[PDB]
Symmetry: C3
Subunit: 269 residues, 3 copies
């Protein structure tokens, strides 16, 4: 595994995430390190998990996914090392961070990271991120056996985060805002491609209510892509993996209709 993909909440504005790569480089000088992001919101293990959901599929099987948003650092919350179905390794706090990454490619084997010989010593209690997660990630990239990191554990011993699921209701489908595509202000839902094919049939616009905004009701064209309506006009579309989203063509949807994650969305014919 010569590729190490690296995510955290330490930011990219100071030297911290780079000290981590320094440790990794020394351990695994044959390795390539690519940053996922270091801009996860601080302590926000669910934001990080969401960022990581599509990382398994996008990255080659020879990747180590090294991840650390670890406000539980220096406590009884351990680090885990996981082999997934794709053959990738993934290292991080057992705090639910890897939950959605594992939804895409389940755990096949899991170990708690307990061995001193895969840690950067002496381990600093406020930076398990660098001393255990990053170092272990580098040891594995460097050819270390997974079983050498510490004791096997059962996959149910991996902490999982609840994720709401969209459903059929009254006369359409009810889901919620999962996240915002912050670079553009597009809104992303948890509504899968399959649920809405009944109301996709007729070429007519759909009804969308967002209840968090004094109960806003929009009528909206279901589009393949942004360019299909006039600039600044709203659309509905399937985002880049298979969820319903809302945006304005070459404008910012949420600046116009201020939704947050959690907000309910119903679509109906």
């Amino acid at each position: 595994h010569n590729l190490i993909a690296f995510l955290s909440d330490v930011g990219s504005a100071d030297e911290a995430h780079a000290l981590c790569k320094g440790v990794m480089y020394g351990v695994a000088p044959a390795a390539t390190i690519v940053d996922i992001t270091h801009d996860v919101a601080p302590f926000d293990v669910r934001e990080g998990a969401l960022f990581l959901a599509d990382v398994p599929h996008s990255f080659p099987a020879h990747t180590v996914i090294c991840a650390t948003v670890y406000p539980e650092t220096g406590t009884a919350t351990h680090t885990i090392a996981v082999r997934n179905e794709k053959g990738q390794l993934l290292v991080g706090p057992n705090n639910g961070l890897l939950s959605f990454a594992l939804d895409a490619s389940p755990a096949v084997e899991c170990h708690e990271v307990l061995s001193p010989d895969v840690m950067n010593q002496p381990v600093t209690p406020t930076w398990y991120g660098k001393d255990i997660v990053a170092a272990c990630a580098a040891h594995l990239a460097a050819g270390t056996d997974l079983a050498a990191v510490g004791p096997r554990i059962d996959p149910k011993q991996i902490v999982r985060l609840p994720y709401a699921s969209a459903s059929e209701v009254e006369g359409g489908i009810r889901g919620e805002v999962v996240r915002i595509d912050r670079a553009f202000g597009n809104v992303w839902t948890n509504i899968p491609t399959h649920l809405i094919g009944s109301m996709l049939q007729d070429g007519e616009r759909l009804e969308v209510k967002i209840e968090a905004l004094s109960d806003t009701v929009l009528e909206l064209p279901f589009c393949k892509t942004f360019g299909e309506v006039d600039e600044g006009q709203p659309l509905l579309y399937l985002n880049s993996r298979g969820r319903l989203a809302l945006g304005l063509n070459q404008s910012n949807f949420i600046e116009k209709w201020p939704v947050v994650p959690g907000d309910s969305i119903t679509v109906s014919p």
Copy 2:
């Protein structure tokens, strides 16, 4: 071409630009990927183009310049693959993005990217950036023949953006603000080294009017570098490739004199 240089408007604050590198890595595991920037303003194809202008000269001939600011994604606007005079390859939306990069090293051969075998399938209509641009960029880095991407097209079929040119007027030279050096607030013009050598002769300060600010007139020393005046004092200078600029020594010029791109600048003796 084992070097891939990567620019977009998707931002570096979430996992998106990294999923792109993931796709590329899988295709071209021998490749090095360096980010240009992922902070281009959203949909701002002219800002991206400006960022890319000096990239050809600075990068080695074995570079693939992979670029994607593509609000036309999933439409009749195609992706193009270009070999330039330097021998570099460049892949991106035919939307004017590569215009200024091509000013520095013209197109020698150009193809539209139409072949399924250089795309990451199935292609998502809202992310041609990842599925066509990035994948094609990776295929080429991986040794793929340029002609294998799709149909040759003539260089005039590459969309070009208008760029104003500075000129001789009344009693000096009239140009405009091209961009701001945002990290420092220095102002960059389109006034070439050659135009002002007549007023460079005498060692005297120059007159600079910026008409966008109720008609501001400054008298200003023409300097080699910032350090040549006292701290916080204004200067004129030739920036790092050969355009006239304005700044304060170890301060922020535009915070003091609020110009935007487009604003006219005349310099005279």
Copy 3:
């Protein structure tokens, strides 16, 4: 030295720091380039120096530490190339930038960078950062002898920045805020592990006065890690290399108690 670690104040939001990597890649195509940060505050050579302090220890001996915050560019302030005790090379403005990096691993040999053959020609007076620092860094990574860069100089000819030291006073220890961990708002002091072991004995909370805030006095638990108090409650702790710090558990300390660097901190039993 096949690893080049790169820091500056040019930002990561435009193409500038990437043009630098372009130059380096062309010179040293065998090299790996990792960014330290490009977000140092503009012209802030002391902020950059602080960021660089722990870089020697974290990075392998085969690193070139290439660094450039150089508002003295195009003046009599020269660039220097240094071999340290660890065997690493370090290239940058002789402006105090490398001061704290050198505290961690002193200079063993030093040269001013004067030779044209390790510069990217022609050298632009406003970007010694790219044309001399980065290019030289790349030449050295590429196998160039250190002595080939220019004239040896004595280590006392390297400009050093003053750093306050914490001390014993009245009935405890008096130090100061060195920097803030900006991603989290934790406060970092210059108080070493060794000074406070006398008041560490008894398991009791400590007194901390911060005089810059109308004279704030907190009573505070000395902890190994954040998780040891309730969420949102304040702690004292030893940060990740051996200095006393203050934070809130999974909250932002400085947003609550607005300290800056320079502010005095006394701890006492």
